[model samples]
Target chain A: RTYSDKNELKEEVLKSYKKYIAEFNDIPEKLKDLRIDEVDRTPAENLAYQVGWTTLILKWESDEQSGLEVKTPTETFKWNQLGELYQHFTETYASLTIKELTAQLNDNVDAIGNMIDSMSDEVLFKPHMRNWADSATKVWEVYKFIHINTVAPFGTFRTKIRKWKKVALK
Target chain B: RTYSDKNELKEEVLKSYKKYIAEFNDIPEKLKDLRIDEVDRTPAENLAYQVGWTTLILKWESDEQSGLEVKTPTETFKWNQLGELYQHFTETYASLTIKELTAQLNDNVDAIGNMIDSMSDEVLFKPHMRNWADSATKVWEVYKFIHINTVAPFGTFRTKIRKWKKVALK
Candidate 1:
C-alpha cells in the first residue's frame, strides 16, 4: 500500500495543493484561448483562491517538516539520516511510515470536503431565523457579531466590485 | 393579554412583522452615515439585516391578510406567511398555535436561530454539530459575495448573484 511516512504524505498534499492552484493559474489561459472579454464567477473565485493559497503556502513553507530529508539522491539508504528511523517503523510493518501516506490522505479528504462548501455563502453573521432591531442599536439585535473589521477583510477579496467603485473610492 | 384563536393569533403576528421591518429599514441610513467602507465588518453586518427584513416585508406585501381589519402603516400577518409565521412561534408565551409553530419552528429555527456560527480550524465538524457547509455557505461565503454584489438587484430583495453578474454579463 502507498500508506507510508511523513515524506510520502507531504508529497501527496503538496501535489494536490499544486493542482488546485493550477486551475487558478490556467484561468487566464482559458481567457486567452477563447479570446473572450467575459469573466465568470468561477474564474473570479479561482483567482481569489489562488491568492489565498499563495498566502497559505507561504505560511506552510515556514512550517517544520522533520522528515523533509536533508540530502537527496547522492546519499545511499545507509547514509540517509532517517534511514534507521525509517527502518524501525518499516520493520514494525514492512511499509515506510504509513503516517505520512495517511496524512496525505487527510489533505485529500480536506480538499474534497471543502470543495462543495467553497460555493456557499460565507456569512460572518447568518440571516437569523429572526432578529429585531429598534434604532439599529436595538436589543435582541444579534446574538453574535461577524466582526468584518481589521481582521478578516473579505471585501479586499472579491473580484473588483465595479458597482461600489462610485461609492467606495474618493 | 393576547391569547389564542388560531386565526386571531396570526393577526398579531403580522403586526409584529410591520414593527420589526419598520425598525430594520432605518439601518441603511445609519450605515450611510457610518460610511460602511470605513467601518469594519461588525457594523457592516449589523446593516446587512436590512436584506433579511426587506425579504420579509415584501413576502408579506402581496399576500392576502383577510382576518384582521386592514390598517395603514401596519404590516400584515398569517402563520403560513414567513414574517408572521416566524414571529408567532417566537414572540412570546402566547401559547396559541404553539403546536403549529413546532414543525415550521424546527426548520426555520434551525435555519435562522442557528444562523451565525464561527468556524475555526480549531473547530471540527461532525453530526452532532451544525452543518460545516451551512457555516461555510452562509456567513463564510456571503461576505465574499456582498463585496462584488454589494447592490441588491431585486430592488425588493437582494440579488440572486448569478442572476445579476453572471446573467447580465451573458
Candidate 2:
C-alpha cells in the first residue's frame, strides 16, 4: 500500500522492523547460523539479508545526493544475481553474533527512518523521483524502494522465521 | 504490531482497506457470487465476511457506550460458530451486487476510521479498556479489535481474492 506521508511510511517501517527483530530474541546463539530444512535462511542470514537491502537503500540515496551515478540494487551485483547478492550478504554479515547483527539491523533501520524524516512527500511518493528507482520499466518512487526493501520483506521474513523457530525449537 | 497512536492505526486500516477493495474492481459482476475450488469465498462472500466483522466492531463499541452488555463477535453467534457466523454473513450480504457490497465495505471502514479519530492512544492501544475486547483470555484493546477486523483480514483476503481472480479469470 502507498503511504500518504513520510511519517506514516516511517511508522510502518519501524513497526515492521521491530516485529521482525523480536523473533530473534529467543533464538539460541549457536543456532543463529543453523540452517534448518523448514526455512530458507538461518537467523544470522535473515538479519544479513535485511541489513544488506537497508544498506543499499541508504547508499543509493547518499550516492545520488553526492552527484555520483547510482546503480540500481548495487554497483557490483545485478538484480538477476540476487542469489549471489544474498550470498554476499551472508558472507559479509553472517559471521557476527545474532546480538551484533540485531544491533546493525536496528542502526540501519534507524538510518532509514531518519532518511524518511528528511524527505518530502513528493520525493518519497511521486514516481521517477530517483534514477535508480526508475531503472526498471515500472517506475518506483523512493518510498516504494524503501517499502519493498524494509517493510515488505520484514513482514515476509517474520513469517519465515516464525516457521523456522517452530521447527527448530521443537 | 501495536500502534503508538490513533493516526498510525487509522492510516494502516485505511491503506489495507484500499488495497483489499481494489481487488474487487476487476471482478466480473457475474463472477461476484461464483464460488470456485481454489478460494474459499466468492467475491461477494469475501466482501460480506469483511463487512460483517467491520460492522460488529462498530456495534461492539456503540453497544458498550449505550450501557448494554457487549457480545464478542455478535450476540447471536458464538466464537466457535464462526463457520455458522460466516454462513450468516453470506446470507445477509451475499445477495448485494459487487458494487453495493464495495460501497458497504467502504462505508464500514470509513466508520472505523471515524472511530479511530475520536479515540486516544490509551483507548486504542492499552489492554482491557473495553469488556468486549477482553472477553477471552487474551486481553485485546480496542485498536487490536479494529486491526484484526480490518488491516489483518484485509491483507489476507486480498491474497485470497487475488488467487481467486487468477483461477477464476483464467
Candidate 3:
C-alpha cells in the first residue's frame, strides 16, 4: 500500500509510496544539492555520496538546533556519537513534533555511529555498552530505548511539567 | 468558583484534573537538568523563563536534524557549527524517538551557559545586552531564563524520544 491509483486498487500503492518516500525521502534533493555544490559530496555517483545524501539531510536538521536554542556541551558529545550509522536510525521516525526530537538526537547518533563504525564486531554489539563508549551503532540504539522506549520528541512533553513555580507560587 | 463551596466543587475538581491529565501541553523537563543554583534574581523571572524556555522547547515542535541513527563525526561538527550559531538547519522529530537529541542539546546548552557564566559583567553586558549585562545582572537574566524555563521540559522531551528505536541500535 505504498502507492495509490484513482481506483480502489490504491492502498498497496499508497503504502509502498509512503515507505519509498520515507526511504528515499530526500535523495533527489541531495543529488540536486551536490550538483550545485550547496552540499558537500564526492560527486553524487559515488556510493559514499549516495550514502552522504542522508548525512547531508541529517546535517541540515542538526543545524537547526542552534536556532532552537544554543546547545550545551553534552549535546556536542552526542552529535558525533550517532553520525556514523549507515542506515538504522531513520527507520524509526514517526510524524508530528517527533521531528524536532530527531534534530537534537543527530549529534549522538553521528557520534556513536562513528564510534562503532571502527570497532570490532564484539564491542560493536552487545548488552556490554560502556557509558563513554564510542560505538556509534550501539550508542544510537541505546539512545532510542534509553530511559524507557521513549525517543525523539524533545518539546512535546517538555512544556507540560515546567510549572513547578506555578505549583509553589500559585 | 475558587472552590469556596468545597463539596460543591467536586465536579469542577475532576474536570480540572482531566484537563491537566489529558492535555499533553507541558514545559520541557530537560530544563531542570541544567543545574542552576539561583532563582528570580532578575526583573522578570517567570516571564523571562516563559519566553526563553520556549527557545529550547519549541525546538522539537519544529523540524530539526541529527538523531540516534546517524553517526558521531557529522554530529560533532553540528555541535561546533551550531554552538556559534553560524550554520542553520531544520528537522522533523517523532515522539517515539529523540533522546539522543535531548542529551546532545543539554550538553550544548551547558557548555554555552558555562562559557557565558565565566565572563565578567563588562563582557556579559556588551552592546547587545548592554544594561542587562552590567554587574552580572545580564548573566543572571540569561541564567534564570535558561534554568527555570528550559531545564525540566527538555528533560522529559529527552525521555520520550528515546523510546522509538531498539536499544541495540546505538
- Candidate with maximal TM-score: 2
- What C-alpha lDDT do the candidate models reach, one value each? 0.26, 0.58, 0.26
Whole-model alpha-carbon lDDT for candidate 2: 0.58
- Per-residue alpha-carbon lDDT of candidate 1 for residues B1-170, written as tens digits (9 for 90 to 100): 01112222222233333332233232333333233442232223222322333233222222322233322112444222444433432333223232332233234323322222222211211221222112212212222222211111111011112222343344
Q: Is model 3 an incorrect, acceptable, medium or high docking prediction?
A: incorrect
Model 3, runs deviating above 4 Å? A1-34, A37-170, B1-170
Task: Please write out the lDDT profile of model 3 over residues A21-102, one tens digit for every residue.
Answer: 2322233332321322221111212222222233433343344434443232134434443333322233322111223323
- Per-residue lDDT, model 3, residue B14, is 34
Residues A1-170, candidate 2, lDDT per residue (tens digit)? 12334554565556555555665676678766665443345667666766777787778778878887665578788755666887898999857998998898788778877877787766666556766554522222222221222223223333332333343334
Give the better candidate number (1 or 2) by TM-score. Answer: 2
Better lDDT candidate (1, 2): 2
DockQ of each: 0.02, 0.02, 0.03
List, in order, the clash count of every candidate structure. 19, 0, 136
Per-residue lDDT tens digits of candidate 1, residues A1-170? 11122232333334434433333222232232122223222323322322322222222222312323222211233223333533332343332222332344345335533432342332212332111111111111011111121011111211112222234443
Rank by lDDT (best first): 2, 3, 1
